[PDB]
Design a protein around this ligand. Structure first.
Ligand SMILES: NCCc1c[nH]cn1
Lengths: 339, 225, 58, 233, 277
């Protein structure tokens, strides 16, 4: 009686939302970008080859100085790389080898990681003893850790295999805010430039926009035919791309709340692993299971170029804050830099 | 020659780090990684107790071999999103409770719990991530199983089994049913063993099944097989 | 099963909020992304504008 | 973090003596160690250096061959053997830790040092612009120094260091690489340079800012210290 | 001279084939750091032995055979001694590979857990070379039983059947027995522990081929030298058959980097990265 009433009402609200979205779809992004000149054939070459890992690499993140970067591999060690000289700065032994995510703090003072242990470990790099140590262990997730990103030296956002996402206070070590609503495992998240909003993708083929201060879902996005793995905010903070097992990247707009462009090719028979944007946002770089990475024109949706040189699936990607280089990681235990 | 005084010391630090990463890798390649699986009440507790958050790590040494067991039975998340992390383990230990032939799954609308364990075994065996990894099947609760079969026939689980309710025949039929799930018999082998709460001969069986796997993998790498 | 009733009421309350938000024409948002790229295309990206010199990774 | 030097004492001319230092409160094996001695007259001079791992050692042309440096990482101890002691060897020897990685601050911690008494070149010369500067608390002070060679390396870093040895205390790192302020130092201290001439500014002179300021170049070995600028109250 | 030009071309092709194949194995070892296992080093040693047969030996031989190019007495000893050393080293390397394989199967635990320093591995490789030179080389140099009037380039101890037999024992009979023993034991391990039947048959065939190829190449020449040295001095004009046997020992060098390094899976992976790109 009341259950079916709530269900029909829900579907009525959803039809109303779909109609409201359609009402604003007067034109496609392709029609607007028709007059813009193409990007042309992109060319990038391997400038640095970083070795030292011995297992599958799963995560990597650039530092704010565009010179330092942290890499995570299931061999049990995190490595801080000097991308210019290739000299290792630190080697952090992991208490749990099965990590799948890593973050460099904006201040460069702390590093985070986690995985199947359901714990996010914070490592301090500026200890007076001259060695890295664990600052705090954030526990409370009922599932493997999927992604983590620093808001500040004391606040960090996290996502786990459990549908819940949480905002953590490092000083106290408790969840300041919890986010729920996903019907599937959350795989990745992306913080906005202003650090006031962030999006998260899950295996339910949906993406949700969250408010850090309030904690409510403001917008829900759909359109993917399979699990969403990667997600990245557009440099301006008004759009984000998502990568899926379906082999189709899609661009979503927040203000319009609709999909604007889809990036896919008939020869791509594999899913997406990582997504990133250039400093200008004109280039959309995505990692693919097929031992390569395609560069897509965000405006024209043309695959301008391809990056190759890995012997196994590309696990992670990252562009520097200055846009002078692009790092790539793969299960072959090698990390490379293009330019 | 073109480096400063401080830049020639960072190189030494990086070369000393590269020297400790390889020494640990050479220490992790001489160890046996064992993935542990099992359904509810599958006797996995007794197995781990006799042999010795999310992933649970248990380490032990038997006859100069260092083993590391990885219990993932507590991970309630999507298996296809983290099972690939264990690609390359030496072997997989699968625990099944024989007494489940008359116990329904948590969702009583579904098939028997033994059929659920069989489906899980089929899913984890015929997986693209473990086509080359062998499996070790421990059939738990044999003692109690021998008792219930006298009270409840085995046909409750297998309505097409035309045999006898004796312990030996029922156990052999269950073993055959579980072994027949191997769709890649030309590359994967299954080592079945019967265990109870009082038996302590499981670690030796694991040792033998791991030496056999190591021997066969060495022979295959050389291109002889 | 009041748990499902509460879940459905929460889902309804959530869906109401999404409908409430203001939305803008796709064209306006498309133009804005295009404008951002052009304003920044000349010098900021070194991927589209390869920098003959001053490249650290040379 | 603490360094305790020991082994000093009176020695006959041409004799031998072995100094020892023990580290605590930090990873001794990760830091490189230096020996710096202060003659009876205020002034510093580099003696020797041993890298992390005992893979690189350097000595000064004034003691090389006569002295020897060694370390014991399993016990976090440092040693300095001496032979054919000259009359000029009388000085208070200090132990200094130094770790070299991107963003590190070498010479960050100085020990108390021990005193030793003896019974009766393309080196980059660093010259400070003033030996003593009378100043009272409240105003700013600008110390200056000059280098006989361009310390600005092609990598972009200017290997200039500033130290402050308060009366009866050990030197303290103020600024490293001519641009980075050391940890624990207040914002009163700042520095700049054009490549050959450098300056150290101290705003709002407090009561714990008097003493001899020593400049040091780290472009290459040997390490050369300045003549010292004593801010007297 | 009509027949000779074709012969020269074929002989050069055989030398080129041998050197090219062994160079590829060496290339892979240097390029890939994954090939740092004991087996990989042993394969490299085998490749080095074989590669020089391709360059140093077979070509010096061509003009001297077909074109009767004059040989210096100093040059003769170098060619004799080098050819013998390279061939004996290849046999000894095969025994080493078989022993290592036997060790892995016979004592798997110790094999995996023991860590071998490069010092032990280099010592083993050097020992193979030292023994190989020692068995035949001194005799070519000293205790030469010197021949007169050139006498082509026989080692010079050929006149004596007993010395020829003793050397053949050390470099062929003892090795062939050992390889057979190691291979038979390897088979037994799996056999005493239908898909199992097909794998045992496959294993049997592979071990048999390795022993058989080694035996067929090396044995006919060695047996002939002794049987001739019994009824003659095994010096002077020879039959066409005697020369066919000569080439057979050389042919093993081409087949060896194919049988041992290619069959190994790790090497195949390295080759794919280098060539397929
Ligand atoms: N052992 C060198 C003799 C020989 C025969 N054939 C080729 N070489």
């Amino acid at each position: 009686s009341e259950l079916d009433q709530l269900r029909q009402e829900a579907e009525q609200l959803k039809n109303q939302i779909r109609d409201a979205r359609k009402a604003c779809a007067d034109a496609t992004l392709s029609q607007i970008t028709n007059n813009i000149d193409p990007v042309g054939r992109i060319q990038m070459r391997t400038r640095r080859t970083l070795r030292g890992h011995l297992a599958k690499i799963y995560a990597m993140h650039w530092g704010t100085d565009s010179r330092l970067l942290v890499s995570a591999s299931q061999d049990g060690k995190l490595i801080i790389w000097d991308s210019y000289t290739t000299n290792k700065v630190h080697a952090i032994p992991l208490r749990s080898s099965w990590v799948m995510t890593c973050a460099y703090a904006p201040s460069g003072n702390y590093v985070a990681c986690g995985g199947l242990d359901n714990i996010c470990s914070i490592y301090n790099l500026k200890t007076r003893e001259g060695n890295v140590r664990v600052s705090r262990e954030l526990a409370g997730h009922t599932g493997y850790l999927s992604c983590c990103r620093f808001l500040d030296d004391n606040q960090i956002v996290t996502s786990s295999g459990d549908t819940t996402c949480a905002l953590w206070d490092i000083e106290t070590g408790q969840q300041t805010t919890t986010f729920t609503g996903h019907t599937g495992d959350v795989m990745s998240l992306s913080l906005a430039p202003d650090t006031r909003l962030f999006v998260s993708g899950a295996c339910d083929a949906s993406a949700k926009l969250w408010d850090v201060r309030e904690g409510m879902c403001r917008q829900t996005f759909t359109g993917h035919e399979s699990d969403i793995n990667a997600i990245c905010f557009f440099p301006n903070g008004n759009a984000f791309a998502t990568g899926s097992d379906d082999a189709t990247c899609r661009l979503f707009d927040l203000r319009a709340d609709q999909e604007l462009m889809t990036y896919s090719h008939d020869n791509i028979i594999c899913g997406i692993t990582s997504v990133s944007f250039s400093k200008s946002g004109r280039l959309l770089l995505a990692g693919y299971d097929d031992f390569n990475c395609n560069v897509w024109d965000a405006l024209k949706a043309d695959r301008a170029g391809v990056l190759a040189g890995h012997d196994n699936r590309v696990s992670c990607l990252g562009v520097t804050d200055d846009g002078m280089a692009v790092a790539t990681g793969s299960w072959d235990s090698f990390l490379k830099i293009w330019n | 020659c073109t480096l400063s005084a401080e830049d020639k010391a960072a190189v030494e630090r990086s070369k000393m780090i590269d020297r400790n990463l390889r020494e640990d890798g050479e220490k992790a390649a001489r160890e046996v990684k064992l993935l542990l699986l099992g359904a509810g009440e599958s006797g996995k507790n007794t197995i781990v107790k006799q042999m010795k958050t999310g992933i649970v790590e248990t380490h032990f040494t038997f006859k100069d071999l260092h083993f590391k067991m990885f219990d993932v039975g507590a991970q309630r998340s999507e298996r296809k999103k983290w099972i690939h992390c264990f690609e390359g383990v030496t072997a997989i230990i699968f625990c099944v409770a024989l007494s489940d032939y008359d116990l329904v799954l948590a969702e009583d609308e579904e098939m028997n719990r033994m059929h659920a364990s069989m489906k899980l075994f089929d899913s984890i065996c015929n997986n693209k991530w473990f086509t080359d990894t062998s499996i070790i099947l421990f059939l738990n609760k044999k003692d109690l199983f021998e008792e219930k079969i006298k009270k409840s026939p085995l046909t409750i689980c297998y309505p097409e089994y035309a045999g006898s309710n004796t312990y030996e025949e029922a156990a052999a039929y269950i073993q055959c049913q579980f072994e027949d799930l191997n769709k890649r018999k030309d590359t994967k082998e299954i080592y079945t063993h019967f265990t109870c709460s009082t038996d302590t001969k499981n670690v030796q069986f694991v040792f033998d099944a791991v030496t056999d796997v190591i021997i066969k993998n060495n022979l295959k790498d050389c291109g002889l097989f | 099963n009041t748990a499902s009733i509460a879940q459905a009421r929460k889902l309804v309350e959530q869906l109401k909020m999404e409908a409430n938000i203001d939305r803008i024409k796709v064209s306006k948002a498309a133009a804005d992304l295009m404008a951002y790229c052009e304003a920044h295309a000349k010098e900021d990206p070194l991927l589209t504008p390869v920098p003959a010199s001053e490249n650290p990774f040379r | 973090v603490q360094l305790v030097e020991s082994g000093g004492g009176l020695v006959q001319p041409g004799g031998s003596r072995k100094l020892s230092c023990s580290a605590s409160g930090f990873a001794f094996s990760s830091f490189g160690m230096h020996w710096v001695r202060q003659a009876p007259e205020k002034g510093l001079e580099w003696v020797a250096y041993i890298s992390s791992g005992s893979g690189t050692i350097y000595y000064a042309d004034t003691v090389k061959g006569r002295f020897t440096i060694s370390r014991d990482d399993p016990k976090n101890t440092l040693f300095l053997q001496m032979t054919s002691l000259r009359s000029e060897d009388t000085a208070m020897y200090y132990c200094v830790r130094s770790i070299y990685y991107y963003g590190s601050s070498p010479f960050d911690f100085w020990g108390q040092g021990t005193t030793l008494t003896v019974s009766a070149s393309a080196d980059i010369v660093m010259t400070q612009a003033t030996s003593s500067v009378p100043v009272t608390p409240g105003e700013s002070v600008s110390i200056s120094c000059r280098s006989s060679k361009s310390l600005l390396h092609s990598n972009g870093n200017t290997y200039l260091y500033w130290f402050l040895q308060r009366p009866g205390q050990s030197p303290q790192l103020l600024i490293y690489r001519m641009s980075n302020l050391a940890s624990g130092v207040p914002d009163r201290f700042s520095g700049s340079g054009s490549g050959t001439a450098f300056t150290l500014t101290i705003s709002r002179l407090e009561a714990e800012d008097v003493g001899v300021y020593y400049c040091m170049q780290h472009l290459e070995y040997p390490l050369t210290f300045g003549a010292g600028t004593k801010l007297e109250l | 001279l009509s027949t000779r030009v074709t012969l020269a071309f074929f002989m050069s092709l055989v030398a080129f084939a041998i050197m090219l194949g062994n160079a590829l194995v060496i290339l892979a070892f240097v390029v890939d750091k994954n090939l740092r296992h004991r087996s990989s080093y042993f394969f490299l040693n085998l490749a080095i032995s074989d590669f020089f047969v391709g360059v140093i030996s077979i070509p010096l031989y061509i003009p001297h055979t077909l074109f009767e190019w004059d040989f210096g007495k100093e040059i003769c000893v170098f060619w004799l001694t080098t050819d013998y050393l390279l061939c004996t080293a290849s046999v000894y390397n095969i025994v080493l590979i078989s022993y290592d394989r036997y060790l892995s199967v016979s004592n798997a635990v110790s094999y995996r857990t023991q860590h071998t320093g490069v010092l032990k591995i280099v010592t083993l490789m050097v020992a193979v070379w030292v023994l190989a030179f020692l068995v035949n080389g001194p005799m070519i140099l000293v205790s030469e039983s010197w021949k007169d009037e050139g006498s082509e380039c026989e080692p010079g101890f050929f006149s004596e059947w007993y010395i020829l037999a003793i050397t053949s024992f050390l470099e062929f009979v003892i090795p062939v027995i050992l390889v057979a023993y190691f291979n038979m034991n390897i088979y037994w391990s799996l056999w005493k522990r239908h898909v199992e039947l097909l794998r045992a048959r496959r294993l049997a065939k592979s071990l048999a081929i390795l022993l058989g190829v080694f035996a067929v190449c090396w044995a006919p020449y060695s047996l002939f030298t002794i049987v001739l040295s019994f009824y003659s001095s095994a010096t002077g004009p020879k039959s066409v058959w005697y020369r066919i046997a000569f080439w057979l020992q050389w042919f093993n060098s081409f087949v060896n980097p194919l049988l041992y390094p290619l069959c190994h899976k790790r090497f195949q992976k390295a080759f794919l990265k280098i060539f397929c790109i």
